[PDB]
Amino acid sequence: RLLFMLVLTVAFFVAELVSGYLGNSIALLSDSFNMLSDLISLCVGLSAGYIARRPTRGFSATYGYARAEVVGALSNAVFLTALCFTIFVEAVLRLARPERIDDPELVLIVGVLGLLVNVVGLLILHVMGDALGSVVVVITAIIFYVLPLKSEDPCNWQCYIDPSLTVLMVIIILSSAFPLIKETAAILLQMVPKGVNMEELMSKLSAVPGISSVHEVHIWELVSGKIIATLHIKYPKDRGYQDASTKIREIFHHAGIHNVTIQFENVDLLLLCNSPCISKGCAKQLCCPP
Amino acid sequence: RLLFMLVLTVAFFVAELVSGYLGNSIALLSDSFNMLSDLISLCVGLSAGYIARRPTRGFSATYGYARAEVVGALSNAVFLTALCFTIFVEAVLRLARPERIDDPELVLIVGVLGLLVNVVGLLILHVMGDALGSVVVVITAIIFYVLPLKSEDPCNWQCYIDPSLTVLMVIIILSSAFPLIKETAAILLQMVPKGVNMEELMSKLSAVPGISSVHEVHIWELVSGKIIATLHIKYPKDRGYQDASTKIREIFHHAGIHNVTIQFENVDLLLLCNSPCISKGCAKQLCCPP
Ligand SMILES: [Mn+2]
Ligand SMILES: [Mn+2]
């Protein structure tokens, strides 16, 4: 990996913020708010590179800090969505009251210098979609320079191109952030991973010879590949559960789940958990409550 | 509960946005961005009221959707932080280039009408801290009305009060959001709950008579009160684990943990998991890897 991007990305995010406010362009602010999310993603990816190759497994994080690439990706998409909200709000108010660009050259220079950065990125969807936002800035500046507007004249159609294309860029930016908030929140909501087929898996689980009942089947995803499947299983007292255990962990293996914890409880009052909390009053605090 | 707040809060968030942009006040935009987070929190709390009293426990969410009050609270604090970032950026640029208030009356009216809403809130820290942001708006409007500034004059000291107090309000707003991002991310990072004393708990766990080894001790928090504690425990083959199990689940009960799953594995090669994935190649995909 190479990390020599924060030096460039952070430096040009500030440049596009200053030039976006000094040059009076929402497209420049939009792109700078996109490069800020790009630097947040770079920091998250670098943090996820130091969490890996150096596990911790401490007394306060029993699973480690490997979930920081999902929390840091949902916190970056929500950050970007909130930034796009303000960009959209400032883009609708400039469609009502139009304003112009004071320095097209300062917008064009930093517009290209920042489009040339997303070409020293992937070459050597957000990264793919960050380069289109840097084309809008150079398009708007060109329209204001191959067709100038003297300070003394009123706003023409040109004052509308910048807010109109910035609204389109918010729709394009939020068309990739929206699939990311839904895909990452499902992980942090303790939902079953999308790849796992919980219908076939639970149909095969009940077909294991020697198994009498299966309850508390919790399957969730820590990170990609790491799927934890808690499971309680009742079994007749006169039969061992060794071959049953082997079958259950081989069924889960074929489903891509390798972190399987099975609690074997001995054996319609024979279908509840034999081992809830030590008191009946714990039923309020039990998950999958009885 | 009462839900007759979205009708008021959503209606006045739009009013404070329009009047904050039509009246040229960052404090009004700051408060409207705070009332937007307030309505997002109201929607999250109402969703968490319908997830409760009606559990689902489906085939795609084995723990239910009870984690939506933690994901929806981290997504609301990050949303608020990103909004405060834009508010702060527009507050530093107005400290450099000062602007004034076009309609102090429109700022004062909607300033009070929106301070009277946070008095029809708690009465019948963010809610406590939303009312201070509505005092800054009424303070700034008063200074511009008990001391007017004709359009023909340059900006005096009055043009600085609004950005200066909005910077202070961002610090106050982010002084309650920051403790919320750290407290909610620890839950979504699968970290040990703060209340649980993992030192005394793990010291008592190893002192249970009949237990030979304890590994894969995963304790995490779904929501407040619901703590799930996965655990693998080795034991001698000639001794049963019934009394040991009772002791272990009574030790966890005294620690506030009632969702305990124990995998009893039979018995320094006697201290590893007896039941990893069915193949040695799964060690890469195992959590707490061997
Ligand atoms: Mn760009
Ligand atoms: Mn308020």
From Swiss-Prot, chains A, B:
One of its GO terms (cellular component) is early endosome. Changing residue 130 to A: No effect on localization to the plasma membrane. Loss of manganese ion export across plasma membrane. One of its GO terms (molecular function) is manganese ion transmembrane transporter activity. Keywords: Antiport, Cell membrane, Disease variant, Dystonia, Endosome, Golgi apparatus, Ion transport, Manganese, Membrane, Neurodegeneration, Parkinsonism, Transmembrane, Transmembrane helix, Transport, Zinc, Zinc transport. Changing residue 126 to A: No effect on localization to the plasma membrane. No effect on localization to the plasma membrane and decreased calcium:manganese antiporter activity. Changing residue 38 to A: No effect on localization to the plasma membrane. No effect on calcium:manganese antiporter activity. Changing residue 118 to A: No effect on localization to the plasma membrane. No effect on localization to the plasma membrane and decreased calcium:manganese antiporter activity. It is a multi-pass membrane protein. The chain crosses the membrane at residues 2-22, 32-52, 73-93, 105-124, 127-147, 161-181. GO terms for biological process: cellular response to angiotensin; detoxification of zinc ion; epidermal growth factor receptor signaling pathway; intracellular manganese ion homeostasis; intracellular zinc ion homeostasis; manganese ion export across plasma membrane; manganese ion transport; positive regulation of ERK1 and ERK2 cascade. Residues 53-72 are cytoplasmic. Residues 23-31, 94-104, 148-160 are extracellular. Induction: Down-regulated by zinc. Down-regulated by angiotensin-2. Up-regulated by manganese. The keyword Manganese applies. Coiled coil: none annotated. Calcium:manganese antiporter of the plasma membrane mediating the efflux of intracellular manganese coupled to an active extracellular calcium exchange. Required for intracellular manganese homeostasis, an essential cation for the function of several enzymes, including some crucially important for the metabolism of neurotransmitters and other neuronal metabolic pathways. Manganese can also be cytotoxic and induce oxidative stress, mitochondrial dysfunction and apoptosis. Forms homodimers. Forms heterodimers and high-molecular weight oligomers with SLC30A3, SLC30A2 and SLC30A4; heterodimerization is mediated by covalent-bound tyrosine residues, occurs probably in a tissue-specific manner and could mediate the intracellular zinc transport activity into early endosomes and recycling endosomes. Belongs to the cation diffusion facilitator (CDF) transporter (TC 2.A.4) family. SLC30A subfamily. It is linked to Hypermanganesemia with dystonia 1: A metabolic autosomal recessive disorder characterized by dystonia, parkinsonism, extrapyramidal signs, severe hypermanganesemia, polycythemia, and chronic hepatic disease, including steatosis and cirrhosis. This is Calcium/manganese antiporter SLC30A10. The lineage of its organism: Eukaryota, Metazoa, Chordata, Craniata, Vertebrata.
